[PDB]
Amino acid sequence: TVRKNQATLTADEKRRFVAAVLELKRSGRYDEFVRTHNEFIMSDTDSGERTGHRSPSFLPWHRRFLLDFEQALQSVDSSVTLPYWDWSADRTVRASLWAPDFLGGTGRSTDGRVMDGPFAASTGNWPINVRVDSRTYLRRSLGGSVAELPTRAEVESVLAISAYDLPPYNSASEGFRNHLEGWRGVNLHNRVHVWVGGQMATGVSPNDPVFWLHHAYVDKLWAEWQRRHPDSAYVPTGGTPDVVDLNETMKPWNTVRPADLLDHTAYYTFDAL
């Protein structure tokens, strides 16, 4: 399986991806992914146990999470794979990504409701069930809460950091992981969530299909980082409380460790790295 840049998908590839996503939704499997992410984002804390976020395992965790989703998508249409969104390149509301034939665009000013695309509430095909408030429609406010998406230069500065992560291994840490996550520095991953707005800026961010494309690229950036620093590897490597060490297993799966997800090629490759 090859994960391609969303901007390069053919009309038919976009069609099959959308159809597969909508089916996971109809069957009720999609909402469970949304729930899983929210539950973890709400429990991962700087002071205690953290697995999915603000911790060294943020990367392998979302890697495995995306694999689960891609596998579910493939169970619907075996030809489908997770595309990625290079937000440093496609940074305007005009990117093909936000077209009605793909993900739809930004929400209207009154209530942030997305009005076009296959995930607009009006289609009757994308009810927001797993939520934190009463609104049951997809919402977006592209570039509303934050002016700009990260630039290539800013991404490069983060990819230059040699250390994977550093004690205290949380949102206050220096190193690659935390800068990519965004809690410190120019802010990459976190700022993108904020830029999209709507459900994407909340704990139930997977409600927006763009969630998968965003994380597929963050995941690609980790792969590019490993290429830049072959002498650097996942840390910690043993005996660190509240943090998932290299050879320790990760929740919710329990049967996989960060050591099993370091090499993405065991599961997929990119159109270009």
């Binding site: 949102s171 809690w183 700022r191 800026a201 909340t202 704990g203």
Partner: protein, 72 residues
Amino acid sequence: AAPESFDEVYKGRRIQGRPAGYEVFVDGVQLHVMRNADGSWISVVSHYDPVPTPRAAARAAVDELQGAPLLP
């Protein structure tokens, strides 16, 4: 040292905060909030956008909700 409690009406809605390690409520409905290592805060309705204080997080929630009731 946990932050001080607060109570006010922001944009027509009542927001309250109090040490528990801290709880926030919007119109009586609890809002999940978390404290970052650097002292800033985030809520479930803005979990990737740190703000300086719990009240800032409650105000951010009311902003985001645009009048919509919070779900327990």
